[PDB]
Each structure stands twice: as C-alpha cells, then as structure tokens.
Design a protein around this ligand. Structure first.
Ligand SMILES: O=C(Nc1cnccc1O[C@H]1CCNC1)c1csc(-c2c(F)cccc2F)n1
Length: 270
C-alpha cells in the first residue's frame, strides 16, 4: 500500500505545467508504468468519485480501449496525488518523432491522424473533453504502431454549453478563444486536430502568434496533397460551425483506405 512498496521508481520522463512524471515498474508483475505527481496547491480543477478532476476524467476513459494511456491506480499524499499510468515500451512521443523525421509521409500521417480521431471519439463517448490535443500529448507504441493520448490535466467533462476557461496550449487554441474567451468542446477539438494534422504533414505548427490564428490563412511550407490541404483548411475554419464533425473528417476523401496500426509499424516504424 505504500507507493514505495508496490513500485520501483526509475528516472524522470518530464516535468512542467502538468507536474512531474517518472518511469517505474510494478513490483507484483514487473509491468512497466509511469508515475505522475501533481501538487495539490497546483490543482485548480477538482471533482469527486475528493480528487483532482484529472483522476475523474481518467477513470472515465480508462475502461480498456487502447487509444488512451490508462490510469491503473492512484494515491493521495498530504500535499500531492500520485497517478500510476500505463507505459508502452519502446515508446516515443509524437513531438520527438516528428522532430526526428521531419514532415511525415501522408500514408503515415493518415494512419496516425485516424488513430487520434478514434481516441478523441472514445474520450467524447465517455463524457470527457481532453482540451490539449497536440504532438507532445500523443505517444507512439512503436512495436504495435498504436497511438495513445496522455495528459488529461487540462480536460473537462464534455458538455454542450460554452466553455469560458482554458488552460491547454495556446497555439492549438481556436480563434473564438483568442477573440472572445469562449468555445464549444467539439468544434474547439476539431480546430486543434487541424493544427495537429498540419504539424504532421509539414513538420511544424501553422500559426505562432494570435494574429495569425485569428486571420486563419493557412500557408503550406511543404508539399501536401490537395485533399490533405482541403481537410486541414476545413478543420481550421474560422467560424466554429463551419468546421467538420468527426464523422465528416473520417468520411473525407483524404481519410480513405487507412493502414491498420500493425501494418503501419511494419511499413514505417520497423
Ligand atoms: O501519462 C503519460 N505521460 C504524461 C501524463 N501527463 C502529463 C505529462 C505526461 O508526460 C510527460 C512526460 C513526457 N512528456 C510529458 C505517460 C505514460 S508513459 C509516458 C512516456 C514514456 F513512457 C516515455 C516517454 C515519454 C512519455 F511520455 N508518458
């Protein structure tokens, strides 16, 4: 029951706005894990089963489907919570992967983007809005060609009314947030997915400054097919209601004939 006695702690994987995250092994069966610490003073969103809203969201999405890193257990300490999360091995985040490869071939980006869409749909089906979809928050299980979302620490319960709070990543945030401090969940998620898909096929994000986000003119700095460009620009429609639904994204001509994850690993990752 001590954290100490169930887990051998390994080295730090990263720290930041979300807390500090370490590699670990579960002693009972040697299962690789990740161990995330969050200081209670740093938590502003709370929920109940009293825990961080992050733990509520995780428990909602962690019933089995493999497109999210699951919450395996958690602990409360006097000044912090400790979350025990899945750890694939070998693994690499998508930011690192794109940094190393540069812009992804479209077949690969299609496979990755499709898996992200399936994972986001799973979250929304479980009643969870992630609100920080980006390269750094997507892990690639390199052996199986499977992508997995991490970091629910800026997420919220999914609702149909306006959100007036945001603490995700600004350059992935939509023009309605920038201009009005208001957004709806789904259409804000589709904007972020447009930013993400551009990042995959171009190797960097399309917008740095607020003025570029609100102008929403997309320039392509690498060669990208016309169908991919069209999907990106649709996702990045300035008016929220002009963006595609997940169903419309997944029916788009660019999204046809996706590789399976295992095929994807055999072709592009092995
Ligand atoms: O939940 C996860 N991670 C996380 C959560 N909540 C906030 C941040 C999180 O991650 C931080 C560490 C890596 N960058 C961000 C997680 C599980 S496995 C893992 C991971 C890995 F096993 C190898 C390399 C990088 C990894 F991310 N991460």
């Amino acid at each position: 029951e001590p954290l100490e006695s169930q887990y051998q702690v390994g080295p730090l994987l990263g720290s930041g706005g979300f807390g500090s995250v370490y590699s670990g092994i579960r002693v009972s069966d040697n299962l690789p894990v990740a161990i995330k610490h969050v200081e209670k003073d740093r938590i502003s969103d709370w929920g109940e089963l009293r825990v961080p809203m992050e733990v509520v969201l995780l428990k909602k999405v962690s019933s089995g489907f493999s497109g999210v890193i699951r919450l395996l257990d958690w602990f409360e300490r006097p000044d912090s919570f400790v979350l025990i999360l899945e750890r694939p091995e070998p693994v690499q985040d998508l930011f690192d992967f794109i940094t190393e490869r540069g812009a992804l071939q479209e077949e690969l980006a299609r496979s990755f983007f499709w898996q992200v869409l399936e994972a986001v749909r799973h979250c929304h089906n479980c009643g969870v809005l992630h609100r920080d979809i980006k390269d750094e928050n997507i892990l690639i299980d390199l052996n199986r060609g499977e992508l997995k979302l991490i970091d629910f620490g800026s997420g919220a319960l999914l609702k149909d009314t306006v959100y007036t709070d945001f603490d995700g990543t600004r350059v992935y945030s939509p023009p309605e947030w920038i201009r009005y401090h208001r957004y709806h969940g789904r259409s804000a998620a589709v904007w972020s997915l447009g930013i993400l898909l551009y990042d995959m096929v171009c190797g960097d994000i399309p917008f740095e400054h607020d003025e570029e986000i609100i102008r929403g003119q997309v320039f392509f700095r690498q060669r990208v097919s016309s169908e991919c460009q069209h999907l990106i620009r649709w996702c990045l429609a300035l008016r929220p209601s002009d963006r595609p639904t997940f169903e419309e994204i997944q029916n788009h001509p660019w999204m046809q004939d996706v590789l399976l994850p295992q095929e994807t690993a055999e072709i592009h990752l092995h």
